[PDB]
Design a protein around this ligand. Structure first.
Ligand SMILES: *[C@@](O)(C(=O)NCc1ccccc1)[C@H](C[C@@H]1CCNC1=O)NC(=O)[C@H](Cc1ccccc1)NC(=O)/C=C/c1ccccc1
Ligand SMILES: *[C@@](O)(C(=O)NCc1ccccc1)[C@H](C[C@@H]1CCNC1=O)NC(=O)[C@H](Cc1ccccc1)NC(=O)/C=C/c1ccccc1
Lengths: 306, 306
């Protein structure tokens, strides 16, 4: 029993973190095989960020313009290239701790674990959703750039995020491990701001299923809803519209609990209209949207407490 | 910016987890140097838990009654002894991944990271407070016994918890790495239940300091309070009484923000009496008590957003 915001175990990723310095700028990199990946802004000063031309800034560097430290060992850089908003530094040593891995671009609403790092040293691990607005509500300070987000499936690490910047509202923006930003953000000083965000409806429903698996039914009701009538309420409450593909994804949770999706929708509608009346669900007084349907199946028992 | 329930990076602990089987019972162990630690109930069946005599159950085992698997390798057991509610299995191989470590008994209100494990394989990591009632609100399923809690200071792992059981309310109980239970619980079937719990007042105040460091002051007020008048309100709201030693602990946070402790107490009093009026603090609609003063200093910037 219990339900916690759980991260994946971080050791396979810890063994990949290094420090990258160019000039007076230092941040973290990710060392897999004989490549180090890092935010391309390592080549900039604070003034350069006001209007950087990365191609022009980079051509002025050599391989020895970059210092890479892995623990206490210096790794020699023997090649460099830009890929979108990252650099790919070739190094003289292949990482012996390289796990099985791949690069994935995750989608809005999906969750991942962040290994916060400073100076190549890991400091903490936490779980994050990718918001509909393509931000994350992280916890990052100066020096955290190049910290990575990841999921683990079997013993394969799927890297999906590298940290680049904080926006004015205090939320965080970054790239996939091809260097393509999530969202419309750019690695230069602008008036950029997080777009309006939405609640991740699919996750809310998944978390209500978790609450039933773990033995609680208080918020269920005798009603049902159409998808469309449900969406009219959703729009009023700044929830994402639910689709049939979402309904299908909730199949396995629906089956485990015996509650049809649209009957769980009607329970959510009631919760939205009436509130929770001073009650909690899985310990929370609000509706939680940072657990996906897969997160619930991973964590919860496969036997409902009936 | 941001503030998240952050765990320590788990790799130093992952490299220590094994599987321990005795008879038909399988659970996890912790392998440091040439010892494996595990819950002594590995020697019991379900019927034995109704009234186990551990001394009598154990004398009937040999070394080869225990099978220890570390990844895919079998480790031979060459000695065994009971220590309180754990076994200490001696093995034929010293763990080459043994970190720098120590065993600590943590105190009520202090926080730690849990590495949930099944069959010797780590599955997730999350942060937990030790409740005043000597329980943790974890997330554990069958097979998680022997999962450990820990803190990391420099590169030293301080192990403080090993998991043994779930109580009827769904919260979790266990031991330190000497095998002494936290709280009044016993490793046998009884009518045992979690005592009434309390809110961890010191942590609430620490988290209000975090909110000021991160730039928010809405809940402050022009008033001050005596310690005693503050405690009269605390008792009415099921908060732990605040003491002078708590006040002292909050010194460094008080200084960083320029808010005296007792003036922060008066802001809490007002919050308790009046509520939060539909507002949030660090994203939360409730007062959070699972971050210690040290947790706040570790995570927050050392420069207040004034
Ligand atoms: C990274 O750690 C980092 O890159 N530091 C090095 C650096 C290089 C060149 C110029 C400036 C800095 C850092 C992480 C941030 C810092 C605070 N919280 C974190 O998440 N990233 C930055 O400092 C970036 C640099 C940048 C990237 C893309 C576009 C413009 C700038 N800037 C920001 O993150 C700005 C944050 C901010 C927050 C509040 C008020 C003003 C500015
Ligand atoms: C452990 O994984 C475990 O030890 N499993 C092996 C075992 C050996 C011998 C007898 C029984 C089981 C497990 C972890 C629990 C299971 C569910 N969530 C977890 O945290 N621990 C238990 O199963 C213990 C065994 C026990 C220890 C101390 C005193 C009595 C029994 N029991 C419980 O945890 C009971 C839980 C429970 C929950 C709801 C309703 C009834 C019982």
């Amino acid at each position: 029993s219990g339900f916690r915001k759980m991260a994946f175990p971080s050791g396979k990723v810890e063994g990949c973190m290094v420090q990258v310095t160019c000039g007076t700028t230092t941040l973290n990199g990710l060392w897999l095989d004989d490549t180090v990946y890092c935010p391309r802004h390592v080549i900039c000063t604070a003034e350069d960020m006001l209007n950087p031309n990365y191609e022009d800034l980079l051509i002025r560097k050599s391989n020895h313009s970059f210092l890479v430290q892995a623990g206490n060992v210096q790794l020699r850089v023997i090649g460099h290239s830009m890929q979108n908003c990252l650099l790919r530094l070739k190094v003289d040593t292949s990482n012996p701790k390289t796990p099985k891995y791949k690069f994935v671009r995750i989608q809005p609403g999906q969750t991942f674990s962040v290994l916060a790092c400073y100076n190549g040293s890991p400091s903490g691990v936490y779980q994050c959703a990718m918001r509909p607005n393509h931000t994350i509500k992280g916890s990052f300070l100066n020096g955290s750039c190049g910290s990575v987000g990841f999921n683990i499936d079997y013993d394969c690490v799927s890297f999906c995020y590298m940290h680049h910047m904080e926006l004015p509202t205090g939320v965080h923006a970054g790239t996939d491990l091809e260097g393509k930003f999530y969202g419309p953000f750019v690695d230069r000083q602008t008036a950029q701001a997080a777009g309006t965000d939405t609640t991740i409806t699919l996750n809310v429903l998944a978390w209500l299923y978790a609450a039933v698996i773990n033995g609680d039914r208080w918020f269920l009701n005798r009603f049902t809803t159409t998808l469309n009538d449900f969406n009219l309420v959703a729009m009023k409450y700044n929830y994402e519209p639910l689709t049939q593909d979402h309904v299908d994804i909730l199949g396995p949770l629906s089956a485990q609990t015996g509650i049809a999706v649209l009957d769980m929708c009607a329970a959510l509608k009631e919760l939205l209209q009436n509130g929770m009346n001073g009650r909690t669900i899985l310990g929370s007084t609000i509706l939680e949207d940072e657990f996906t349907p897969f997160d619930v199946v991973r964590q919860c028992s496969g036997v409902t407490f009936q």
